[PDB]
Design a protein around this ligand. Structure first.
Ligand SMILES: NC(=O)c1ccc[n+]([C@@H]2O[C@H](COP(=O)([O-])OP(=O)(O)OC[C@H]3O[C@@H](n4cnc5c(N)ncnc54)[C@H](O)[C@@H]3O)[C@@H](O)[C@H]2O)c1
Ligand SMILES: NC(=O)c1ccc[n+]([C@@H]2O[C@H](COP(=O)([O-])OP(=O)(O)OC[C@H]3O[C@@H](n4cnc5c(N)ncnc54)[C@H](O)[C@@H]3O)[C@@H](O)[C@H]2O)c1
Ligand SMILES: NC(=O)c1ccc[n+]([C@@H]2O[C@H](COP(=O)([O-])OP(=O)(O)OC[C@H]3O[C@@H](n4cnc5c(N)ncnc54)[C@H](O)[C@@H]3O)[C@@H](O)[C@H]2O)c1
Ligand SMILES: Nc1nc2c(ncn2[C@@H]2O[C@H](COP(=O)(O)OP(=O)(O)OP(=O)(O)O)[C@@H](O)[C@H]2O)c(=O)[nH]1
Ligand SMILES: Nc1nc2c(ncn2[C@@H]2O[C@H](COP(=O)(O)OP(=O)(O)OP(=O)(O)O)[C@@H](O)[C@H]2O)c(=O)[nH]1
Ligand SMILES: Nc1nc2c(ncn2[C@@H]2O[C@H](COP(=O)(O)OP(=O)(O)OP(=O)(O)O)[C@@H](O)[C@H]2O)c(=O)[nH]1
Ligand SMILES: Nc1nc2c(ncn2[C@@H]2O[C@H](COP(=O)(O)OP(=O)(O)OP(=O)(O)O)[C@@H](O)[C@H]2O)c(=O)[nH]1
Ligand SMILES: Nc1nc2c(ncn2[C@@H]2O[C@H](COP(=O)(O)OP(=O)(O)OP(=O)(O)O)[C@@H](O)[C@H]2O)c(=O)[nH]1
Ligand SMILES: Nc1nc2c(ncn2[C@@H]2O[C@H](COP(=O)(O)OP(=O)(O)OP(=O)(O)O)[C@@H](O)[C@H]2O)c(=O)[nH]1
Ligand SMILES: Nc1ncnc2c1ncn2[C@@H]1O[C@H](COP(=O)(O)OP(=O)(O)OP(=O)(O)O)[C@@H](O)[C@H]1O
Ligand SMILES: Nc1ncnc2c1ncn2[C@@H]1O[C@H](COP(=O)(O)OP(=O)(O)OP(=O)(O)O)[C@@H](O)[C@H]1O
Ligand SMILES: Nc1ncnc2c1ncn2[C@@H]1O[C@H](COP(=O)(O)OP(=O)(O)OP(=O)(O)O)[C@@H](O)[C@H]1O
Ligand SMILES: O=c1[nH]cnc2c1ncn2[C@@H]1O[C@H](COP(=O)(O)O)[C@@H](O)[C@H]1O
Ligand SMILES: O=c1[nH]cnc2c1ncn2[C@@H]1O[C@H](COP(=O)(O)O)[C@@H](O)[C@H]1O
Ligand SMILES: O=c1[nH]cnc2c1ncn2[C@@H]1O[C@H](COP(=O)(O)O)[C@@H](O)[C@H]1O
Lengths: 451, 451, 451
């Protein structure tokens, strides 16, 4: 076949469908290939898959799911800054380990107020001055509240709490694993971490979820990694603070055409106000474009212009690049400076994901391929997109594993035991390509139900 | 408008789409109308809706769901008798109240065996001679087993059980509400009901589910009502016993054409071997047909021939009846002997359900309208059906409430405050009808998403 | 429901799809219903089904098949009279019992001539003056000829015949059953029936075929009943003789509109030149039309005008009648004089056949429904038909039994144990009908594969 360099020296407009990969020597099982990949210069993920920040794709629910499956979710603009910050708060509060700021109450409150807290925040389990300085009086939970009816709005916590002397508690200074051990071998669900003066909390739901989700992408504090997209205008500097107060780990600068003085200024702003925050540059399709955002200190580069399944940018603008050529030509340069690429748009099926991953992309952000799932949101001003529709596609819980299995099988029967080794062979020529004619693409095709 | 008698005196082939109902005097809210209806002569349901016993509709999962929503599910033939009995067992074991036959173990077993029981039967909580005579040694549960790894298959229950002296227990003789009270005000999930000699169990999951499902159709023992369809041949008499050992409450005799000596013999067999079982006659579309099955002592009558969304019986047979005319003409006679009718086939939307309910049907069985949901099964020999397909329709949990809301709104704006009063007015003329021409049906029609 | 008289008193244009039959009391198995029916006043058939004489439906092969399945075949006009007579000869020679005119040879012939006879006539087994007066010299057959190669065209029958002294033979005067017994208990295939002077033949193939085809419609001489369609012009009187020399049993007078002086003249000609030949009148759709052909002495009446699946007669002519109304109104009168009716055109599926049989038709003739089968032929001048096409439909051997099964099931679940009792009930009101609206026909409908 043809090496990547020889394939892309043709100067043709090679998208993904314009070439294939010649298979290799299988030497391992379909479940042994490692999918480890980097979302950012200082964030590593188990699943290279990402969810694109669009109004009908990525909100708190999709971010929760995609962080549980080892990926990540980026939240969108079509909402108020307060709404975006609230969604990020939900994402980071889904699974938390140390519950350092419970929904605390004072013994003067009422079971009706406990029910109100259950509705508004979701938790029926809340410890009972009503601040993070109160020596425990007790705890309330579903098993203390549930049977009460017609009397909740008139019953003090006095009649239903658990007096602390009956509680099991732990000291302030024990590590998380030790607190988990004390919780596990206490046959109870909540272990308040208390100070020597008797003034955080760890739950069992977090451990059950750690069981249920082996690949969940968690931070150093056992909270789901979350990201957010911040614009380039002046107003964006209040949105950025309102959200970074929520602790977003990575931000993608949202812009159709990335290379500009404006995004460079926004970078120089972020990388000087919050030096520990990780940034992703704007959509570039050229090494000359990416040079500026790399010199600006950016840690990752979104790649793709006009190749979206919902994007008519080429039609309306006469600018862009073929998807696969852009991805290869940009990643071959970004790789020189440790900057992950993200192939955005153009991905219709798992073969496209595998092609993009082999072409240099350290991760892959997808849009419409993830839309219409049960977790997705919903049930002059020249335009650049179409208000399309997609058929129902089920839950991410069932869908993402299909993609992971497909990528692993592809790596198996292409001969790569890891997504790093795959790229190594590609950049060393041990992996081979061949172009496809329209008749060949016709040949390679055809009630289909993969699961 | 036209009374029901005057409408059906026309002798025309009036299906549901061939007439409408003139609205009346609204005097109440959309949520005040009562939907109480009888599935059988001695079974009353909260939701008149039923799920038809077909290979791609009704299995254990669908029956569980439809019993939770106040309806009922009938299990099909396309499987072994053992499979059908197992499915009925699952349905009756989903929510049980008194757990009279737990998955009991002996202290000589192993945590690996507890995990095996969790996988095969589903419960991780099981009490520990290992029979229903053992004085309790302890109990095991997720909070006793979960943290164990690489040692489960070599650890006796000695290291992990809860010694009984630490357990809370109750005496044998307390009523279910008292046992529930002791469980609720003990802050624990399992209360073994023990004899005075210290040799059943009630869980908290049943009470949580009773909270979550107010309208769940439960028997006198707090187990979901379940049904099964048994044929008419000689072999069916072993299937009938193998399933009635599971405690099916109601049986529908499955046959295209009901009136026959064969179904009469099967009736006379059931109603003399298991006199307490309730039977539903075969598909009849005529009062003369229904006379025989009524005199045979049957308690309910399935109605509908050739009107199924997947049925080509008229095309292949030249026999049947128009759906609405059959339903009215048969129910007007069955009503004379307290026998509920079931309108089967011909129902595409909620208006059809409302029409059938107004026409006399005490309940309504549906096929394709419920197919393709997340809960449904799957992902010469002259034929009478087609292997069709349906688009995804989501979960029953979300779908059935749409139907209940629609039927309630229909009753509201037709002026009926209950499904009994609706039928009373219909049979007394206070409810009025009018025929529709093809142009009128064209007029009354038209991206649609009801929820 | 509605009696036939009340249904057809509506004066509407009721085709088959415009009403249904209400079911009744099943009292027997699906294979117990008798399908005996009369093709003509003096021909009774086991299978009411007939094949219509059209260029693309009925030739020798189709007639052979449809006579084997208990029906009959009528041969067409689109060919020379010699061709039609030859086709009838093939039909009557397919299975023959007494082979009274074998392909006889003289011992001076050659094995090459035996092969030539095998190719031209089909039989490799022929007895060896070479006329029906020769005292047998021997017989030749595949087992005497097959191994010979490169020498067949130069070998006399002397080297290969079976000398008569080695043959088993029977006397002239034995009945067919006795000769068959002698053949069966002789362990050989051909038994020459010889005169006392030692000057017919029976094969084992005829007995094997009598085994394989229990319902085959055979004449009094064990030859397949065959028919032919003869025009009404002057030239047709030579075609009639050229074919009646072949022994056609029944003739259908082919004409779009039957009632005319020309067809009456043709009747009066046939019924006076060949008084033993049975005739079928021209297409009538009215009792006033049928009166003339009945008084002309006709023995059967083809019914149907403009209702063919390939006929545009109404469109081009403004004349005809609705199919079901015509069939009922004509058969109710013809029945008065023992004349079978034949419902032609309008039968799309088995339900149509059942409806027609219930309506009075003693038989039914089909066109396109039988076209495209493996047995069918092929692989100003105002027009009245269209050169349409049909999808492949398999062999008659498999397809006819499906129709028998369907008609029998229809009779079962409509409550008729015989096609005579069905008609008797219909004419006495024990069978009931109901009209269908367009919405009802829409309801009763829907990858379908009946076998
Ligand atoms: N990459 C793709 O495939 C693609 C294609 C089309 C659209 N999109 C997405 O749709 C959106 C379109 O981005 P956009 O750049 O058009 O929107 P934008 O909000 O960044 O800006 C819109 C217009 O204002 C300009 N602008 C940017 N920052 C400005 C500032 N601070 N002051 C003044 N003008 C400023 C832009 O150059 C552009 O002309 C983004 O979400 C983009 O990612 C993506
Ligand atoms: N009413 C409708 O809308 C409709 C239409 C078509 C099919 N169906 C369903 O499809 C199936 C078809 O039922 P069916 O009656 O054809 O199937 P079946 O298994 O009851 O019997 C098939 C055939 O055998 C006969 N039969 C019945 N019991 C028999 C016995 N004990 N011994 C011998 N023969 C016996 C029947 O009369 C029929 O001819 C059923 O599930 C029926 O409900 C329903
Ligand atoms: N039954 C149906 O639904 C239907 C409808 C249309 C056509 N067909 C078939 O197509 C063909 C059409 O028949 P057709 O009557 O048009 O053809 P035909 O050859 O019988 O006669 C054609 C014309 O000649 C006339 N004619 C017939 N015999 C005559 C005679 N002896 N002397 C003088 N004139 C004579 C007829 O009246 C007609 O005008 C037949 O095979 C008919 O059965 C059937
Ligand atoms: N309470 C609690 N403990 C956690 C959570 N996540 C990890 N831990 C604990 O932190 C330690 C990490 O163990 P791992 O097996 O590596 O856990 P993991 O979350 O699957 O993997 P990592 O994210 O790589 O740590 C153990 O003591 C875990 O019980 C969490 O969400 N809640
Ligand atoms: N109580 C509490 N839980 C929090 C908070 N923030 C995040 N969580 C997470 O809430 C998750 C579920 O804990 P709980 O709400 O107690 O769940 P539970 O044990 O099923 O309790 P109930 O909701 O009473 O049924 C855990 O993963 C916690 O990390 C917080 O402020 N308070
Ligand atoms: N443990 C347990 N108790 C139950 C169950 N169903 C009902 N009960 C108890 O039986 C009594 C019935 O109370 P209801 O409010 O009528 O319960 P429901 O199941 O919603 O309604 P019904 O089915 O009409 O009894 C109460 O004491 C319930 O707690 C069940 O599944 N499990
Ligand atoms: N233990 C037990 N439960 C049963 C049995 N049959 C039905 N159940 C039902 O199982 C349901 C769930 O109870 P549990 O198994 O305790 O569920 P849980 O409290 O979530 O406990 P885990 O399954 O250990 O997580 C209840 O509604 C019981 O009625 C049985 O034989 N044993
Ligand atoms: N020999 C012969 N058979 C005839 C004739 N007319 C009809 N048949 C039929 O031919 C059919 C087949 O008989 P055979 O020709 O002997 O068939 P076979 O036994 O397979 O013999 P081979 O053709 O030699 O293989 C029988 O059903 C006969 O009735 C005729 O003139 N001669
Ligand atoms: N050689 C020969 N004998 C036949 C044929 N048909 C019937 N026979 C004989 O004639 C007698 C009639 O027996 P049946 O059982 O009535 O035969 P069938 O053809 O199945 O039925 P029928 O047509 O009613 O005579 C028996 O002696 C048969 O062997 C035939 O095609 N060939
Ligand atoms: N540390 C503790 N020591 C003693 N009792 C406690 C402690 N924490 C909570 N409790 C009380 O005992 C129960 C401990 O179990 P847990 O906190 O998991 O309850 P829960 O949330 O109701 O369980 P579930 O949600 O699974 O029904 C609580 O319901 C509660 O009222
Ligand atoms: N009657 C009892 N008295 C004392 N301890 C009990 C009793 N029944 C069970 N236990 C032990 O204490 C716990 C009681 O809570 P429960 O039975 O609901 O646990 P669980 O099923 O693990 O809860 P969950 O499934 O909601 O996490 C069990 O985990 C168990 O091992
Ligand atoms: N009456 C007879 N007596 C003795 N031999 C006979 C007689 N008729 C035919 N034969 C010879 O013996 C064989 C008798 O069997 P039969 O006539 O069925 O042969 P066949 O047609 O070759 O059989 P098949 O076609 O099944 O292979 C013939 O092949 C033949 O040459
Ligand atoms: O509204 C729009 N107009 C044009 N391009 C868009 C729009 N919204 C998102 N995009 C881009 O198109 C991508 C979607 O690619 P997809 O995975 O093929 O759906 C996004 O990740 C953005 O880069
Ligand atoms: O396979 C089949 N052939 C013909 N009728 C069927 C078949 N299966 C089920 N039916 C009938 O058709 C009904 C389905 O009606 P639906 O609600 O309109 O789908 C069932 O309840 C049965 O009465
Ligand atoms: O060429 C034609 N033009 C008009 N009618 C025809 C023609 N050929 C046959 N017919 C009639 O149409 C019938 C076919 O009916 P079918 O079974 O519905 O195909 C035949 O039996 C004839 O009565």
């Amino acid at each position: 076949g043809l090496t990547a360099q020889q394939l892309f020296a043709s100067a043709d407009g090679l998208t993904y469908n314009d070439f294939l990969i010649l298979p290799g020597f299988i030497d391992f099982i379909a479940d042994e290939v490692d999918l480890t990949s980097a979302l950012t210069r200082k964030i590593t993920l188990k699943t290279p898959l990402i969810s694109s920040p669009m109004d009908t794709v990525t909100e708190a629910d999709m971010a929760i799911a995609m962080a549980l499956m080892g990926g990540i979710g980026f939240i969108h603009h079509n909402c108020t800054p307060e709404f975006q910050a609230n969604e990020v708060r939900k994402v980071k509060k889904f699974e938390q380990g140390f519950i350092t700021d419970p929904v605390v109450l004072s013994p003067s409150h009422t079971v009706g107020d406990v029910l109100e807290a259950k509705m508004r925040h979701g938790f029926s389990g809340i410890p009972i001055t009503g601040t993070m300085g109160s020596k425990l009086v007790g705890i309330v939970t579903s098993r203390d509240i549930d049977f009460l009816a017609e009397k909740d709005h008139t019953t003090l916590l006095s009649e239903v709490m658990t007096p602390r002397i009956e509680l099991v508690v732990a000291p302030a200074g024990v590590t998380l694993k030790e607190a988990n051990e004390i919780l596990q071998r206490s046959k109870k669900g909540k272990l308040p971490i208390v100070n020597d003066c008797d003034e955080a909390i760890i739950a069992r739901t977090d451990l059950k979820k750690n069981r249920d989700y082996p690949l969940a992408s968690k931070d150093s504090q056992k909270q789901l990694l979350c990201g957010a997209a911040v614009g380039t205008r002046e107003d964006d500097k209040y949105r950025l603070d309102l959200l970074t107060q929520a602790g977003v780990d990575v931000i993608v600068l949202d812009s159709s055409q990335g290379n500009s003085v404006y995004q460079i200024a926004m970078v120089h702003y972020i990388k000087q106000k919050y030096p520990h925050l990780q940034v992703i540059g704007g959509n570039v399709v050229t090494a000359a474009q990416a040079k500026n955002l790399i010199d600006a200190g950016v840690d990752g580069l979104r790649v793709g212009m006009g190749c979206g399944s919902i994007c008519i940018t080429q039609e309306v603008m006469a600018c862009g690049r073929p998807q696969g050529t852009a991805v290869y030509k940009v990643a071959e340069y970004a790789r020189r400076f440790g900057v992950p690429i993200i192939a955005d748009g153009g991905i219709q099926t798992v073969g496209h994901v595998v092609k993009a991953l082999a072409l240099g992309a350290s991760t892959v952000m997808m849009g419409s391929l993830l839309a219409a799932t049960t977790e997705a949101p919903g049930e002059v001003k020249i335009a650049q997109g179409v208000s399309g529709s997609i058929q129902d596609k089920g839950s991410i819980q069932k869908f993402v594993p299909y993609l992971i299995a497909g990528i692993q099988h592809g790596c198996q029967d292409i001969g790569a035991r890891s997504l790093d080794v795959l790229r190594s062979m590609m950049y060393s020529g041990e992996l081979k390509f061949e172009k496809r004619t329209m008749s060949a693409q016709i040949e390679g095709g055809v009630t289909f139900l993969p699961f």
